[PDB]
Structure 1
Amino acid sequence: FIAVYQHLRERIRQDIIRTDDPVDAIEQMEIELARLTEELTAREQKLAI
């Protein structure tokens, strides 16, 4: 279990996501996902016109 956690801890991407707690990181990631989805929606709307 410890090993698993250790493993995961390294795999964090950048500073705003530097919650050293993986599980805590999950939600942040997902937040990013939602953010990105909104940006994509706006961009594809621009592309249509």
Structure 2
Amino acid sequence: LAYMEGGALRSMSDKALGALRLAVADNEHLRDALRLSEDPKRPERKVQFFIAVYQHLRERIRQDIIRTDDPVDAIEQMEIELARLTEELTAREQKLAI
């Protein structure tokens, strides 16, 4: 993005914030951090929000079965878990039927 004027950057930021609004509807702490982050005179808050995201995304890892501190690398582990749980669901359905 180093070679793009500021107006387009503002537009992408606006669209991303619009998406985040829907995305973080459920959470309250992340929602509050986002609501703080839009003050143009406190830029660091935005950065903090990102940290607050990753930080949060780490605590809810459920590290009991996951290890990757980086949430980006935990998508594979969640996919593994969904596949395993689909197998377990099939087994449970058969057991309930019998």
Whether TM exceeds 0.5 here: the answer is yes
Identity among equivalent positions (%) equals 100
Quote how far apart the aligned CAs of 1:3 are.
4.5
- Alpha carbons of structure 1 residues 15 and 43: separation in structure 2 relative to 1, 3 Å: closer
TM-score (norm 1): 0.70
Task: Pick the structure with greater CA Rg.
Answer: 2
RMSD, aligned CA = 1.7
In structure 1, the gaps of 5 or more residues are none
Aligned residues: 49
Give secondary structure in 2 for the equivalent of 1:17.
Answer: coil
State the alpha-carbon separation in 2 of the partners of residues 48 and 24 from structure 1: 38
Quote how far apart the aligned CAs of 1:9 are.
2.2
Instruction: Name the residue aligned to 1:2.
Output: 51
- Once the two structures are superposed, residues 1-45 of structure 1 have per-residue CA deviations (whole angstroms, 9 ceiling, x without a partner) of 444323322221123302111011111012111101101101111
In structure 2, the gaps of 5 or more residues are 1-49
Give secondary structure in 2 for the equivalent of 1:20.
Answer: coil
Greater relative contact order, per chain length (Cα 8 Å cut-off, separation 6+): 1
